[PDB]
RNA sequence: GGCGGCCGUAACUAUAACGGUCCUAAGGUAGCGAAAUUCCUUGUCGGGUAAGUUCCGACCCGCACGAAUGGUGUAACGAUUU
RNA sequence: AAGCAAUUAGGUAGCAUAAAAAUGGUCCAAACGACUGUUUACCAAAAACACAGGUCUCUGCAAAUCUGUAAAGAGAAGUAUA
RNA sequence: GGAGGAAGGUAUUUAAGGUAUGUUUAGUGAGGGGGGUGAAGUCGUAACAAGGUAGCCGUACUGGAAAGUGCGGCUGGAUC
RNA sequence: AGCUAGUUGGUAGGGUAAAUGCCUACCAAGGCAAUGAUAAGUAACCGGCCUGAGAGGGUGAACGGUCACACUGGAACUGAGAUACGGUCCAGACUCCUACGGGAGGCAGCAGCUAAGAAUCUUCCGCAAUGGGCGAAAGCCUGACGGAGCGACACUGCGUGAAUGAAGAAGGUCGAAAGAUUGUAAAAUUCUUUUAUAAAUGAGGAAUAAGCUUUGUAGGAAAUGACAAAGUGAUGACGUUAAUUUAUGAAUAAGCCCCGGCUAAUUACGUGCCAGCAGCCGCGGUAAUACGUAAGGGGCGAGCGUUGUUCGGGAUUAUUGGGCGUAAAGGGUGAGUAGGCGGAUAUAUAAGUCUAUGCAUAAAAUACCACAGCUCAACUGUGGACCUAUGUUGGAAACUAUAUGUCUAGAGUCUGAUAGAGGAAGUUAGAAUUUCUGGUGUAAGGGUGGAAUCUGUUGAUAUCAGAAAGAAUACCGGAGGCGAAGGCGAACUUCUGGGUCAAGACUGACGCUGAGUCACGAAAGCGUAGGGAGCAAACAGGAUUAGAUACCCUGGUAGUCUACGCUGUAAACGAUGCACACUUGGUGUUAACUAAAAGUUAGUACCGAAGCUAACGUGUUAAGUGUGCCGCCUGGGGAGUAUG
């Protein structure tokens, strides 16, 4: 404890939280077009090689976002619409592409979980 | 100097004596100190106290009062008003001390009294000290 | 007054922090560098111009800068030069 | 007309009212030299010389130094803060 | 003839425009500087044991590099 | 970190419904500011909303109030009211029409279009109700508002069936191929019709207006008329209204996420550090409950997940309710300004506080508690309050505060005693070392783990005598002493600061801490001028080594020293800010009081009970129990960097 006296001349100050994903200026989703797309190699100790796309957004910025589920068609100049969350494998990788988007689509035969993946219902 | 409780030395003298277990203690002397050990008293929290004389200063020596067991009246006895952080309350939001257990002193308009008294006599003021 | 050469060397290519060797009294540190010094040369890149062998800002492969024959800067000053 | 004056207000006139003459062009950047000065009378006024400042070294007084074969004079009617 | 009425003229204030100087801020810029990840590459072995010269702090100088040394200070120093 | 020059104030005047630098002319230079002026950035504000036990934190959707704006920038007119959204004038950009002279236009009104964006509606019906404008009235206008359509966007409710139904159908899955599990689930039988369709019935939003009939009142000579009252009196967009009654029949109707721990829910195949998962820890390398697909299981349900943003969990900005010896955190130290806080006691004031939860004001809605109306709920309505915010009335006075006194125990002055490397200035001393000079004397000296460089036949080292200079003060000397800290040790004097004890009198709270500020501040370093023995960065040589820009050796320039002026940094440490009131002891030690013991007081060390501490440890010199004030901390790196 400070003082009573030391509070009021000096008072509190909380820190101020900080968003993990700046480039979506507090949007929930945004769009761009891919200038690029690879694969790069993650951290130690893991082994894959994910497939991540720079992206220029529709507000300027470059952000590199992943790609997930397995297999995909993001050629060069493909719009597409990125969220938030973060890929610890990844050094940069800070948004993730959204499946079923504009120019991206579900994942084949994917058929649990199929919501976060964009895929249609196969049809019982 | 800058003594700055009356209050508080008292009540320091009196927690430090009690624990460790004194048969009496021997304190500085005010109409405040003599109401509140007066509270005290009534409480059956002391024994007695007693007016004093050393070199022309008047003391005020307390009788300090444990079971057969030694374990004190007293359990804790401490302050809430200060002087740098003075707290003051209505006589509906007084706090009662530890379900009833302990007693609540106060300052009031009416002098010195207990948190009960200040509740009977619907007044309220700053709160001295808790005591159970 | 003086203040060196040659050769080899890294997860392309390039260079060589490094190592070896010969020689000397010792082999140029700081800083600066196509400079009032740079032959090759209008070197290379950037700025200025519609177009700039001059000029300004850098790169360093300094023919042949360099510390009181002072080195690198500097407010103010100049019938100086650009 | 106000106001001590400088100026202020109104009115009048012209294309132009510091009406003639005399009376700074300014700004940005670089090189060299700090600067005021001095210099090739008669083609070079400058980046050259001088400069305050700095270091090294000489000189104990019939001092070092300089002019003369000398005496002698300067240094100096000074004395290492010279 | 007031009505100076109303146009017209003149004057003050003023938006826009123009000129000049400073000032705040966002991009870009040859080249330069350090920082992070990828390198597990090259050179050396400074620290962790008394780390093989005890360690560290402030300051100064010097060296490819970790660093070395001078001065003062500290134990948060084995051993005896 | 300075700002403002109509800026600050005054005297007149201009103007306004009206005060004022609101404006103008003169007269002064004033005004604001580390108690934050000015400037930059951001933002409409409030009732409220979200969250939370509360305090708080975040936030300003809808609805309601205020303010500002209506293309950008100005200006005035009309008017009770405008510096006027669909009025006027001017300038600018843009769009459009021209007969080229010139004109027309402002959806941040209701719909709608383009562009932008992850992202948001119909170019609908009606003035029946409510409200507003005009009119005597009828009546007209009202993209306000009443409704409808669209979007699972949120909130609330309902349905997609219900009851019997096997040791238990087929299949699927797990298995040893006994059997389990899906599972009374289905099938089958029976029952029901909210919803679906059709028909019938059908409240309420509605009040009447004009007009008409009648009564009464004011008025008057009197009707027409006005007012009060009664009755009559057209009128529903919604609307196929809400609700109700029959007719047909299980008919019209479920998905999504997850299953390693956090976190409720496991097995079987395929993949083999590939493919991929992931919020965190982390899984996958040949037997994956974590990947992918099936079988089961869990959660919620016309929704389920993901992302974005806020709060909560976070006591992780700690007033309620955290710390600073070693984890991030005590300033190098002191003196003090503002500020905060402060002994005993008397009186007065009543700012704070408390009370009559007086009395009011805190619009409505929302928020809390009951009671009601929509079939219930959401939603809606009528009452009732809980806080706490301001103003005011009358009281209480202890505490804080204000004003005037009193006291001495705190703190000071005076007196006496006393310890001390406290500081500054001016003098003096010896040992030792180095150099120089003069004797004796000869071949080594010096140095290392071992050597060499180096020194010496120009007489070394060693030894004797003399002279000179510089720096530092053995023994005393330590479980000391003093000072705020840094620090201070040969001897003396002068000048000078502080502490401790006491009946030993005086003042009478005169105090504590202290943002800025000021002073001091080891060593290193810098400027000027001296000095320079020894030691010694840089530097040179000799060795060790692959190399040695080092450790070792021989030399050696700054520096070390003095005077003056700067720098203000240390592991400046007790890694522990200062002050006061308290809380068992043991063993030494310094000073004083006492002749001395013996004890006390003020220090200074070791051990240690209780307590405290994450532990180490601390422990009357607290890191124990309390408070006053100041400084400082909020994950690590980037970084004590970049910039100012």
């Keep these: 404890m400070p003082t009573i006296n030391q509070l009021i001349r000096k008072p509190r100050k909380s820190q101020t939280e900080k968003t993990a994903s700046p480039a979506l200026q507090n949007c929930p989703q945004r769009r761009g077009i891919c200038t690029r797309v690879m694969t790069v190699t993650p ?17 300027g910025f470059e952000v590199t976002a992943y790609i997930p589920g397995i297999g995909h068609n993001l050629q060069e100049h493909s719009v597409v619409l990125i969220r938030g969350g973060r890929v610890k494998d990844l050094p940069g990788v800070r948004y993730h592409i959204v499946r079923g988007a504009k120019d991206t689509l579900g994942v084949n035969n994917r058929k649990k979980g199929r919501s976060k ?3 249609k219902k196969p049809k019982a | 100097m800058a003594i700055t409780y009356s209050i508080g ?8 004596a009690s624990r460790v277990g004194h048969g009496s203690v021997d304190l500085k002397m005010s109409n405040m100190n003599k109401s509140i050990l007066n509270i005290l008293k009534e409480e059956g929290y002391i024994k007695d106290f007693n007016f004093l004389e050393k070199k022309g200063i008047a003391f005020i020596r307390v009788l300090l009062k444990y079971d057969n067991k030694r374990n004190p009246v007293i359990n804790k006895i401490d302050a809430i008003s200060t002087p740098g952080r003075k707290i003051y309350s209505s006589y509906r939001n007084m706090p009662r001390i530890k379900n009833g257990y302990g007693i609540l002193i106060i300052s ?3 002098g010195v009294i207990t948190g009960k008294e200040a509740k009977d006599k619907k007044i309220g003021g700053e709160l001295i000290c808790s005591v159970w």
């Design chain 1, 43 to 59: 951290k130690k100790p893991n082994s894959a090689l994910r497939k991540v796309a720079r992206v220029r957004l529709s507000n």
């Design chain 2, 108 to 110: 009031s308009s009416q």
């Design chain 1, 117 to 119: 993946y964009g895929t």
């Design chain 2, 9 to 16: 030395d008292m009540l320091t003298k009196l927690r430090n």
